[PDB]
Amino acid sequence: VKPNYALKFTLAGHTKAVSSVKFSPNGEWLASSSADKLIKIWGAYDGKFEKTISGHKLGISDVAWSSDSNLLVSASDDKTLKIWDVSSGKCLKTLKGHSNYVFCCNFNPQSNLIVSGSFDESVRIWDVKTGKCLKTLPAHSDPVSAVHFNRDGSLIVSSSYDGLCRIWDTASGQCLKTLIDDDNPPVSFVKFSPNGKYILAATLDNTLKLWDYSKGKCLKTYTGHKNEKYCIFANFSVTGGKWIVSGSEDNLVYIWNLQTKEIVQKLQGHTDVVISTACHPTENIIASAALENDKTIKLWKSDC
Numbered sequence: 205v206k207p208n209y210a211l212k213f214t215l216a217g218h219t220k221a222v223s224s225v226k227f228s229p230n231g232e233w234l235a236s237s238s239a240d241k242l243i244k245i246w247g248a249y250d251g252k253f254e255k256t257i258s259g260h261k262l263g264i265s266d267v268a269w270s271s272d273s274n275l276l277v278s279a280s281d282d283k284t285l286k287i288w289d290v291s292s293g294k295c296l297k298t299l300k301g302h303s304n305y306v307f308c309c310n311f312n313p314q315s316n317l318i319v320s321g322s323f324d325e326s327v328r329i330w331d332v333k334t335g336k337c338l339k340t341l342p343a344h345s346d347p348v349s350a351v352h353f354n355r356d357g358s359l360i361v362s363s364s365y366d367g368l369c370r371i372w373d374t375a376s377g378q379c380l381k382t383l384i385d386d387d388n389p390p391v392s393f394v395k396f397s398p399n400g401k402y403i404l405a406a407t408l409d410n411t412l413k414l415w416d417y418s419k420g421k422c423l424k425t426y427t428g429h430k431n432e433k434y435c436i437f438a439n440f441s442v443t444g445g446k447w448i449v450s451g452s453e454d455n456l457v458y459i460w461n462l463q464t465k466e467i468v469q470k471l472q473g474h475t476d477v478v479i480s481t482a483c484h485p486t487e488n489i490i491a492s493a494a495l496e497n498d499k500t501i502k503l504w505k506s507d508c
């Protein structure tokens with residue numbers, strides 16, 4: 205059993221490399237971020253450009269939605285994060301604290317906290333309402349490539365080019381776990397699984413791994429794509445068949461069977477590295493974004 209994603213819309217607007225695409229939790233919007241210093245908002249179902257959100261002084265590496273789809277947080281080379289009210293476009297807060305480029309960000313499920321990761325080798329935890337830094341974790345020995353909260357917000361997972369995934373207690377800041385698999389390629393992405401039991405991690409040796417982080421066991425690996433250089437997120441597709449989705453440096457989107465780890469589809473059409481993908485929360489829709497030789501975002505839809 206396999207999906208049949210087919211191309212429905214191609215989106216263009218950004219003038220430099222895209223770094224991230226994310227669907228809003230309410231299904232209405234796609235947000236994208238770029239080295240052009242802009243966030244762009246697009247209609248999730250028809251790909252219609254909605255608006256630009258501007259204010260960062262340098263390129264943006266990541267953007268993330270709050271649980272209620274009302275806010276965005278962005279992470280920039282200008283060493284700030286910004287919290288935005290999406291409907292008005294207003295910058296509610298600028299989060300200053302990191303000493304180098306901010307590379308990743310996420311709200312907790314309650315969307316009262318933000319976690320960030322930086323080239324400064326730290327993870328920071330911020331209060332959304334006040335915009336102030338609550339905690340700084342001396343997390344890694346190289347840039348932090350991803351940060352994500354678990355289901356109830358009590359844990360943070362971080363990944364780094366130092367080759368480590370680490371699990372942090374949100375309240376105490378203690379490093380609870382370090383995951384590594386008898387080799388330490390750089391880790392370019394990590395996130396908790398939909399049910400909260402696993403973490404999915406991308407390493408720059410062309411490999412995705414699904415870990416039981418409590419037991420410290422790698423349960424699945426997904427291979428066949430190309431990923432030796434860029435920060436390419438990976439997704440869980442939860443609306444139809446249980447798939448793992450990722451971009452790839454051979455210009456394709458890869459889709460794997462969660463359980464069997466076989467490739468079930470490859471989506472062709474981009475002319476450069478597929479730097480980012482996202483999966484829609486209710487419909488079988490994938491968004492993909494390619495690097496600057498291509499400069500498009502594509503929306504693909506499947507019947508299953």
Ligand SMILES: CNC(=O)c1cc(C2(C#N)CCC2)cc(NS(=O)(=O)c2cc(Br)cc(Cl)c2O)c1O
Pocket residue numbers: 397398399400401402414423424440441442445446447448462463464
């Ligand atoms: C019928 N199989 C399952 O139900 C199932 C199997 C697995 C495993 C396997 N094989 C154990 C090691 C991966 C993990 C989960 N949970 S998951 O990773 O969080 C998850 C991933 C996706 Br894609 C979608 C959803 Cl909805 C989801 O929950 C499962 O749900």
